[PDB]
């Protein structure tokens, strides 16, 4: 066909019950996710081509970069919960791996303060029995589909996009690719 399994993607030997429709995971300290998010608005892009009644979400991982992966891990659950996403993803991206001013929990902390959120609320929030389920929800999700690589997607549990498939000679077709495999996938 146009789109065939271990091609643009691949199926999962093991389908995830319950799994959000549209699930992305990364990691601030991998390369390819810092192109995804500042060269490429992967997720921008996907997004603009569900069909809407479709939700998405994205959780960052462990396995990268030891202790300050985790603390990583724990500060994309107080940018969830507080709901400031778009205003630390950046400047964490840069501070990990242009600047590379981001060298412990503290440094993760001067972010968000930079970013405008309270010291105080922070402080609550990455203490807060809330942010502990939320990070248990990034790692059970990574759980369930042994995830030993990112950038990655998962749609509907049961598909893996695969972005090594698809030509990158121009940026631009493959975003446009990538996202409407999701679409195509999503309508599966």
């Known amino acids: 066909a146009q789109y065939e399994d271990g091609k643009q993607y691949t199926t999962l030997e093991k389908p995830v019950a319950?799994?959000?429709?549209?699930?992305?995971?990364f990691s601030f300290f991998c390369p390819h996710c810092y192109q995804?998010?500042?060269?490429?608005?992967?997720?921008?892009?996907?997004?603009?081509?569900?069909?809407?009644?479709?939700?998405?979400?994205?959780?960052?991982?462990?396995?990268m970069g030891g202790?300050?992966?985790?603390?990583?891990?724990?500060a994309w659950a107080v940018a969830m919960a507080l709901g400031v996403e778009d205003k630390v993803t950046v400047p964490?991206?840069?501070?990990?791996?242009?600047?590379?001013?981001?060298r412990?929990?503290?440094?993760?902390?001067?972010?968000?303060?930079?970013?405008?959120?309270?010291g105080e609320e922070y402080d609550a929030?990455?203490?807060?029995?809330?942010?502990?389920?939320?990070v248990a929800q990034q790692e059970k999700a990574a759980a369930d589909v042994q995830l030993?690589?990112?950038?990655?997607?998962?749609?509907?549990g049961k598909y893996q996009l695969n972005p090594q498939g698809?030509?990158?000679?121009n940026m631009d077709v493959f975003v446009q690719q990538y996202a409407d495999t999701v679409k195509y996938l999503s309508e599966k």
Not at 92 to 102: D, N, P, S
């Open 36 to 63: 995804f998010e500042e060269v490429l608005h992967i997720s921008d892009n996907v997004k603009k081509k569900l069909p809407e009644g479709v939700k998405m979400t994205k959780y960052h991982v462990n396995f």
């Open 148 to 156: 030993r690589g990112v950038p990655a997607m998962f749609v509907n």
């Open 92 to 102: 964490l991206f840069e501070g990990v791996q242009k600047t590379q001013t981001i």
């Open 67 to 74: 202790d300050l992966g985790k603390d990583l891990t724990q």
């Open 104 to 118: 412990s929990a503290s440094d993760i902390r001067d972010v968000f303060i930079n970013a405008g959120i309270k």
């Open 166 to 169: 698809m030509d990158t000679s």
């Open 125 to 134: 929030a990455w203490n807060s029995f809330v942010v502990k389920s939320l």
């Open 18 to 25: 319950g799994a959000p429709q549209v699930l992305e995971f």
